[PDB]
RNA sequence: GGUUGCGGCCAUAUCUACCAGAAAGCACCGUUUCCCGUCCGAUCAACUGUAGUUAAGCUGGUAAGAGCCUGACCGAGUAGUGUAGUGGGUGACCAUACGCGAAACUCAGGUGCUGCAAUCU
RNA sequence: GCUCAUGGAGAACAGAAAUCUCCAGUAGAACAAAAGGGUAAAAGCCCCCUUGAUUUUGAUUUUCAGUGUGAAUACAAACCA
RNA sequence: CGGGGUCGAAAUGACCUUGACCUAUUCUCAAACUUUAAAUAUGUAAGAAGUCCUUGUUACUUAAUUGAACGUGGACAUUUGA
RNA sequence: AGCGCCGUGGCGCAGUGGAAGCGCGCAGGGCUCAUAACCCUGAUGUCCUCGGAUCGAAACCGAGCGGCGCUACCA
């Protein structure tokens, strides 16, 4: 007793109800997936600049 | 059986081109890529490493990461009812820039030039683009340009 | 369901079974191999390959085939003998004369 | 005009296509190197057939490629055994040519019963300079049809040399 | 008949690139050499190109852009005579000298020469221009020989050693400088120094001088004119190395003329294209001659 | 402007048949002791730049040239296609309205440009 | 380092097909297989040396619930060719 | 140059015919052929999380106080970028 | 109609990618007054046809042709 195998009917109505929200883009994104060499240097550089700005205004 | 592979229904898509088989030219490699760069994606089937999926063929994305011979790209992808962020470690043979973004940057610096000139004279820049507005009146003459009366043509079989 | 009748081959013994047409039944990986013939000691067939003078092998199948082959070797005319390797239970099955390469 | 399009030889080559492999082929190689003073180069099959009784990569033949004064010396010895008489049928469509013969010992060889007898195929490649303009690695090029060589000029050269005639066709 | 290709063949034909039609490049190699780690975004990839004609040597420092390769330096056997060589402007020693010269030229224009002096006392050994401590790293350069056969005992590698002695960080290995015994993997620095200062050439000179004076006169004819010998050649090579380290600063010619004078004569002598109207005239004359029925 | 080297775009650059080529530069070319590779100093390595030739390569010009490229107020607003219609028709199909719009063909034109450096009467 | 299929023109035995030599040869071959893409100083043929078919665990893509499995991609720290 | 028919002794000698192959021409085609190539559908950008100038940081990168990433300070408004 | 098997000498039947086996039949010789049987000898197989892959097929995979077989139940 065969059946209805497949259909995409009504799926787009379902989606566009409350649908296709763009992903919330953020400042300062993930540094995962990024070259770890660059991650490491970026860490040390930020440590340096934080120290420098605090020493400029201590 | 049903066959759904990484390189399925891709024949004419990764068909290289006509009279452009063989290797790749060198600006593909001498070009530069930085974080925040927007890039197009067409795939070179002659380079079977670092390829994208056929979904990402002919698409557009942003860079997040850079390595020896490859580049990170972010894409948004419809999955059901949302756009998902998808990260690709692609090769520059498949990358190229977005001239739309290039022209946008040029428009930006020109807008800045206009703001500078209007700081110099206070002369009402009107920076924004505006559409092809509807056109204004005019007077067309007739000299050497008389109207030729036209009319339809009868039915000829033309065999 | 299938009635199957097959002869066990190293013995010559009939084997009748029956089982449904869709159930799995086992098969070995049998292969025959030709081998040359050398001076026959006691029952070990004195054979060899193109790259080996090996085969202190299957010990002389006692059949009329074995006896007729013994006589053919008594009158020479080297006989490329064929064997089979079903389940590592080797045995000689037939032979043919070197019509060339005398 | 003729500054340096004057003609010369590029190479002689000697081929021997033994029907099978074995000591006969080794002996043929011995013969060729005995003549040349330099070692020859063997030749393997291309595919398989029983009419000759052969297989793929079965060492059916041998040959050599030699040059220069030695090459032309061997050549004129071939010519004197060939009574300095040859064929336009033998000459090629380019000026290159050759001839296949028997009884190599005719070339003045101290025969040995071991080596036996072997027939041969001499072939001759003439040219003008620009050989490396085609046969080098850099700035490669296809020569001009003017500087090319042909059957007619080659046979004229070969006849006025030695005053040695050939057949009609 | 056979000397006529097809319209379809010539249509579907894909050209190679221009330099490949001309037989001058391997874009394989060019890619491998100029392509760069994209973390090093704009920092170029500096090739030391070397090339060998008949009667000349070229050594250049070259970079790569999108419009064309771009140059810093140059060096030429046909200007070595400033530094004191007259003959053998394509030999192993002249190659070494050119490499040394371009090295010192670059380090001159960039100030890396006082630091990374290079080498003056030469013996023929393998050692690279290892960096200074607490200072700028030496100039990293990569060899480009185009198509020439990497093979043991070549003037290209002679030039390479010249650069490395001149003070350039070129990466290499000692397994192709001549004297590199294959089975006993050791180089012979004394033989190498002999080839630097003209060992093999002096050996040829010596043997010809003892036996074959007719060839010693036929060639080395300039050496006959100049009264040269098997110590003078070493001494001039050494003094020329010193002069190279002294004043490598590329004094060019005077050119005797101007660009547009050269061009005036060349354009005068030049050919030119037969325009459309006179093409029509040409075919019409062909018609009136032959289609005019004689 | 010419030439050489490294080149970008990779046929307006290719292919074929011929014609010419000041200088310089390339190239052809001469040689085998030396490192080196070859059946072979032909290829490749090395030496001289001497012996000689611009014939070939190379550069350019010609061809109612093949090919390639561009454009058309050539074909063609055709074919196809989006949307609308209680439009027509038995139906296949079609026309109309608001819109987009090919390719082939036909004809005309063009036949490499150009960057860095060095060099040539 | 070489350039394939095929065709043409030659070379005794040798012929349609044996080996050698010249010209053209944009791929009409070959790449373990199915088919499809891709590839011409190569990814094909030959030659030389090797064992990165290695270790650490993570990230990513595809199928997808953004679970697994399988396969692949790009990196970091090592050891190697 | 496949088959042959003829002249004749035959002759890569001569002639005739016939399937091949070559040449350019012609008629018709392709969901699993294609140079070309739409319409419709589809991705991305249209700024403040931005642009410019200056100089701080780093064990990253550079031959290099060169570049990269993130920042200080300042400027760029009303049309803050269809 | 669907599915499966098989096509080998004149006949029958074997045959496993490097290349066809046997018997009976056939032919020749000899013995015999002649034919049989008998003894000595030899030969014969487009491996159903086309195509393919393979360096190469009877075999291995498609096309067709044929001789057969098996299926055919619940109504």
UniProtKB/Swiss-Prot annotation, chain A:
- Highest taxon, organism lineage: Eukaryota
Q: What is its main location?
A: cytoplasm
Report residues of the Glycyl lysine isopeptide (Lys-Gly) (interchain with G-Cter in ubiquitin) crosslink: 51
Keywords (alphabetical) are: Cytoplasm, Isopeptide bond, Ribonucleoprotein, Ribosomal protein, Ubl conjugation
Q: Would you kindly state one Gene Ontology biological process term found in this protein's UniProt entry?
A: cytoplasmic translation
Region entry Disordered: which residue ranges? 1-36
- Where does it reside? Cytoplasm
Drop me one GO molecular function for this one: structural constituent of ribosome
Spell out the Basic residues composition-biased ranges: 1-25
Q: Which residues form a coiled coil?
A: none
Q: Which InterPro entries match?
A: Ribosomal_eL29
Q: Which GO terms describe its cellular component?
A: cytoplasm; cytosol; cytosolic large ribosomal subunit
Q: What else is known?
A: Present with 51100 molecules/cell in log phase SD medium.
Binding partners and assembly: Component of the large ribosomal subunit (LSU). Mature yeast ribosomes consist of a small (40S) and a large (60S) subunit. The 40S small subunit contains 1 molecule of ribosomal RNA (18S rRNA) and 33 different proteins (encoded by 57 genes). The large 60S subunit contains 3 rRNA molecules (25S, 5.8S and 5S rRNA) and 46 different proteins (encoded by 81 genes).
As for what it does, the entry says: Component of the ribosome, a large ribonucleoprotein complex responsible for the synthesis of proteins in the cell. The small ribosomal subunit (SSU) binds messenger RNAs (mRNAs) and translates the encoded message by selecting cognate aminoacyl-transfer RNA (tRNA) molecules. The large subunit (LSU) contains the ribosomal catalytic site termed the peptidyl transferase center (PTC), which catalyzes the formation of peptide bonds, thereby polymerizing the amino acids delivered by tRNAs into a polypeptide chain.
> What protein family is recorded?
Belongs to the eukaryotic ribosomal protein eL29 family.
Swiss-Prot record, chain B:
- This protein's record includes keyword Ubl conjugation: yes
Q: Give the CC-aspect GO terms.
A: cytosol; cytosolic large ribosomal subunit
MF term (GO), any? structural constituent of ribosome
Record location of the Glycyl lysine isopeptide (Lys-Gly) (interchain with G-Cter in ubiquitin) cross-link: 31
What's the miscellaneous note?
A: There are 2 genes for eL21 in yeast.
How is this protein organized at the quaternary level? Component of the large ribosomal subunit (LSU). Mature yeast ribosomes consist of a small (40S) and a large (60S) subunit. The 40S small subunit contains 1 molecule of ribosomal RNA (18S rRNA) and 33 different proteins (encoded by 57 genes). The large 60S subunit contains 3 rRNA molecules (25S, 5.8S and 5S rRNA) and 46 different proteins (encoded by 81 genes).
Q: What does this protein do?
A: Component of the ribosome, a large ribonucleoprotein complex responsible for the synthesis of proteins in the cell. The small ribosomal subunit (SSU) binds messenger RNAs (mRNAs) and translates the encoded message by selecting cognate aminoacyl-transfer RNA (tRNA) molecules. The large subunit (LSU) contains the ribosomal catalytic site termed the peptidyl transferase center (PTC), which catalyzes the formation of peptide bonds, thereby polymerizing the amino acids delivered by tRNAs into a polypeptide chain.
Official protein name in the record? Large ribosomal subunit protein eL21A
From Swiss-Prot, chain D:
Cystine links in this protein are none
Which SUPFAM superfamilies does the entry link to? Answer: RL5-like (SSF55282)
Does the entry feature the keyword Lyase, yes or no? no
Q: Which InterPro entries match?
A: Ribosomal_uL5 (IPR002132), Ribosomal_uL5_C (IPR031309), Ribosomal_uL5_CS (IPR020929), Ribosomal_uL5_dom_sf (IPR022803), Ribosomal_uL5_N (IPR031310)
Any Pfam family the entry gives:
Ribosomal_L5_C
- Hydrolase as a keyword of this entry, yes or no, is no
Q: Which UniProt keywords apply?
A: Acetylation, Cytoplasm, Methylation, Nucleus, Ribonucleoprotein, Ribosomal protein, RNA-binding, rRNA-binding
Give the location in the cell. Cytoplasm; Nucleus
* Highest taxon, organism lineage: Eukaryota
Post-translational modifications: N-terminally acetylated by acetyltransferase NatA.
Where N6,N6,N6-trimethyllysine occurs along the chain? 70
Q: Name one GO molecular function term.
A: rRNA binding
GO terms under cellular component: cytosol; cytosolic large ribosomal subunit; nucleus
According to its UniProt entry, the protein's GO biological process terms are: cytoplasmic translation; ribosomal large subunit assembly; translation
Task: Kindly state the subunit structure of this protein.
Answer: Component of the large ribosomal subunit (LSU). Mature yeast ribosomes consist of a small (40S) and a large (60S) subunit. The 40S small subunit contains 1 molecule of ribosomal RNA (18S rRNA) and 33 different proteins (encoded by 57 genes). The large 60S subunit contains 3 rRNA molecules (25S, 5.8S and 5S rRNA) and 46 different proteins (encoded by 81 genes). Component of a hexameric 5S RNP precursor complex, composed of 5S RNA, RRS1, RPF2, RPL5, RPL11A/RPL11B and SYO1; this complex acts as a precursor for ribosome assembly.
Q: What else is known?
A: Present with 21200 molecules/cell in log phase SD medium. There are 2 genes for uL5 in yeast.
Record family assignment:
Belongs to the universal ribosomal protein uL5 family.
Please give the name of this protein: Large ribosomal subunit protein uL5B
UniProtKB/Swiss-Prot annotation, chain E:
Q: Cellular location of this protein?
A: Cytoplasm; Nucleus
**Keyword set for this entry?**
Cytoplasm, Isopeptide bond, Nucleus, Phosphoprotein, Ribonucleoprotein, Ribosomal protein, RNA-binding, rRNA-binding, Ubl conjugation
UniProt cross-references to SUPFAM superfamilies, sorted A to Z: Translational machinery components (SSF53137)
Record location of the Glycyl lysine isopeptide (Lys-Gly) (interchain with G-Cter in ubiquitin) cross-link: 161
Point out residues bearing the modification Phosphoserine.
164, 173, 232
Output one GO BP term.
cytoplasmic translation
Per UniProt, what is one Pfam family of this protein? Answer: Ribosomal_L5e
* Cellular component, GO, one term: cytosol
Chief site of localization = cytoplasm
- Any idea which GO molecular function terms this record carries? 5S rRNA binding; structural constituent of ribosome
Reported function:
Component of the ribosome, a large ribonucleoprotein complex responsible for the synthesis of proteins in the cell. The small ribosomal subunit (SSU) binds messenger RNAs (mRNAs) and translates the encoded message by selecting cognate aminoacyl-transfer RNA (tRNA) molecules. The large subunit (LSU) contains the ribosomal catalytic site termed the peptidyl transferase center (PTC), which catalyzes the formation of peptide bonds, thereby polymerizing the amino acids delivered by tRNAs into a polypeptide chain.
Family per record: Belongs to the universal ribosomal protein uL18 family.
| Name of the molecule in the record | Large ribosomal subunit protein uL18
């Amino acid at each position: 007793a065969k059946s209805k195998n497949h259909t995409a009917h009504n799926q787009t109505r379902k989606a566009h109800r409350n649908g296709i929200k763009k992903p919330k883009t953020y400042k300062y994104p993930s540094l995962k997936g990024v070259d770890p060499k660059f991650r490491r240097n970026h860490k040390h550089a930020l440590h340096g600049t934080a120290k420098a700005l605090a020493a400029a205004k201590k | 059986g049903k066959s759904h592979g990484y390189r399925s229904r891709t024949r004419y898509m990764f068909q290289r081109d006509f009279r452009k088989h063989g290797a790749v030219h060198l600006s593909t490699y001498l070009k530069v890529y930085k974080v925040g760069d927007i890039v197009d994606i067409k795939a070179n089937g002659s380079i079977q490493k670092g390829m994208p999926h056929k979904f990402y063929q002919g698409k557009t994305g942003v860079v997040y990461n850079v390595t020896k011979s490859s580049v990170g790209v972010i894409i948004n992808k419809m999955v059901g009812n949302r756009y998902l962020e998808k990260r690709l470690n692609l090769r520059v043979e498949h990358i190229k820039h977005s001239k739309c973004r290039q022209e946008f940057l040029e428009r930006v610096k020109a807008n800045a030039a206009k703001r500078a000139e209007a700081k110099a004279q206070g002369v009402a820049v009107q920076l924004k683009r505006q559409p092809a507005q509807p056109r204004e009146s005019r007077i067309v003459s007739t000299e050497g340009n008389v109207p030729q009366t036209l009319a339809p043509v009868p039915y000829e079989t033309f065999i | 369901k299938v009635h199957l009748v097959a002869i066990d081959i190293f013995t010559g013994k009939k084997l009748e079974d029956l089982s449904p047409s869709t159930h799995n039944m086992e098969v070995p990986v049998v292969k025959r191999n030709e081998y040359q013939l050398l001076d026959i000691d006691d029952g070990f067939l004195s054979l060899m390959n193109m790259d080996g003078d090996t085969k202190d092998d299957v010990k002389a199948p006692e059949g009329e085939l074995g006896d007729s082959l013994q006589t053919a070797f008594d009158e020479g005319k080297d006989l490329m003998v064929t064997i089979i390797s079903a389940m590592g239970e080797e045995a000689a099955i037939s032979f043919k004369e070197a019509a060339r390469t005398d | 005009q003729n500054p340096m399009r004057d003609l010369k030889i590029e190479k002689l080559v000697l081929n021997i296509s033994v029907g099978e492999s074995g000591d006969r082929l080794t002996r043929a190689s011995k013969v060729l190197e005995q003549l040349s003073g330099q070692t020859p180069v063997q030749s393997k099959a291309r595919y398989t057939v029983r009419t000759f009784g052969i297989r793929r990569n079965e060492k059916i033949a041998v040959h050599v490629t030699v040059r220069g004064p030695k090459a032309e010396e061997i050549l004129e010895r071939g010519l004197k055994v060939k009574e300095y008489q040859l064929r336009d049928r033998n000459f090629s469509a380019t000026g290159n040519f050759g001839f296949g013969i028997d009884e190599h010992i005719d070339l003045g060889i101290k025969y040995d019963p071991s080596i036996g007898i072997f027939g041969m195929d001499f072939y001759v490649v003439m040219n003008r300079p620009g050989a490396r303009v085609t046969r080098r690695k850099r700035c490669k090029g296809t020569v001009g049809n003017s500087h090319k060589t042909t059957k007619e000029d080659t046979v004229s050269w070969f006849k006025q040399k030695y005053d040695a005639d050939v057949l009609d066709k | 008949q056979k000397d006529a290709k097809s319209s379809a063949y010539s249509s579907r034909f894909q050209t190679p690139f221009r330099r490949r039609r001309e037989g001058k490049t391997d874009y394989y190699q060019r890619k491998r050499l100029v392509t760069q780690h994209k973390a090093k975004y704009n920092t170029p990839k500096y090739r030391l190109v070397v090339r060998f004609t008949n009667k000349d040597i070229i050594c250049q420092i070259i970079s790569s852009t999108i419009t064309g390769d771009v140059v810093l330096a140059a060096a030429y056997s046909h200007e070595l005579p400033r530094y004191g060589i007259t003959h053998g402007l394509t030999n192993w020693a002249a190659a070494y000298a050119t490499g040394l010269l371009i090295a010192r030229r670059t380090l001159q224009k960039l100030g890396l020469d006082e630091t990374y002096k290079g080498v003056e006392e030469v013996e023929g050994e393998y050692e690279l221009t290892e960096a200074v401590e607490d200072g700028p790293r030496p100039f990293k350069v990569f060899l480009d020989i185009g198509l020439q056969r990497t093979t043991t005992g070549a003037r290209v590698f002679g030039a390479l050693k010249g650069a490395s002695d001149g003070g350039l960080y070129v990466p290499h290995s000692e397994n192709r400088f001549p004297g590199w015994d294959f089975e006993t993997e050791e180089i012979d620095p004394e033989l190498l120094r002999s080839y630097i200062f003209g060992g093999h050439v002096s050996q040829y000179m010596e043997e010809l001088a003892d036996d074959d004076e007719e060839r010693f006169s036929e060639l080395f004819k300039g050496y006959l004119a100049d009264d040269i010998d098997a110590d003078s050649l070493e001494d001039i090579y050494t003094s020329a190395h010193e002069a190279i380290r002294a004043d490598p600063a590329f004094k060019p010619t005077e050119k005797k003329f101007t660009k547009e004078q050269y061009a005036a004569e060349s354009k005068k002598y030049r050919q030119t294209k037969l325009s459309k109207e006179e093409r029509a005239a040409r075919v019409a004359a062909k018609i009136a001659a032959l289609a005019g029925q004689q």
